[PDB]
Amino acid sequence: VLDVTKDHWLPYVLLAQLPVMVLFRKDNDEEAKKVEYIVRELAQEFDGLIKVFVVDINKAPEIAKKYNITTTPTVAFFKNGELKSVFTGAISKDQLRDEILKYL
């Protein structure tokens, strides 16, 4: 689990050979903290089968702008360069494993 830079977008994410789950957050949010723990847990559970990253849209707004992501927290699923699925609102750890498995 770690932040990603616009710089590191393509290499770390778009080039990643594993499926990628990215959390777009603003900062100093409570709901974002809760989603961030959910995602931490999913990353460790699926450690070495997917890759999981964070986008602090305060610092890398170009990434959200690129993917037309207007709400935080947002969880995005990227596989082989393309955006495969997006989850907003209330994020269900149960649903994220459902998808993580869908693309695995």
Residue 85, SS3?
strand
**The pair of three-digit structure tokens given for residue 56, joined into one six-digit string:** 């602090």
- Enumerate the domain spans of the chain: 1-104
- Give the determination technique: X-ray
Distances (CA, A) of 64 to 11, 31, 39, 60, 83: 17, 18, 18, 8, 12
Strand partners, 53: 22
Distances (CA, A) of 81 to 75, 77, 99: 16, 10, 17
Sheet of 74-79, strands arranged across: 51-56, 20-25, 74-79, 82-87
| 43 vs 53: CA distance, rounded Å | 9
Which of 83, 29, 25, 13 lies closest to 55 in space, CA to CA? 25
| 5 vs 99: CA distance, rounded Å | 25
Resolution of the deposited coordinates, in angstroms? 2.2
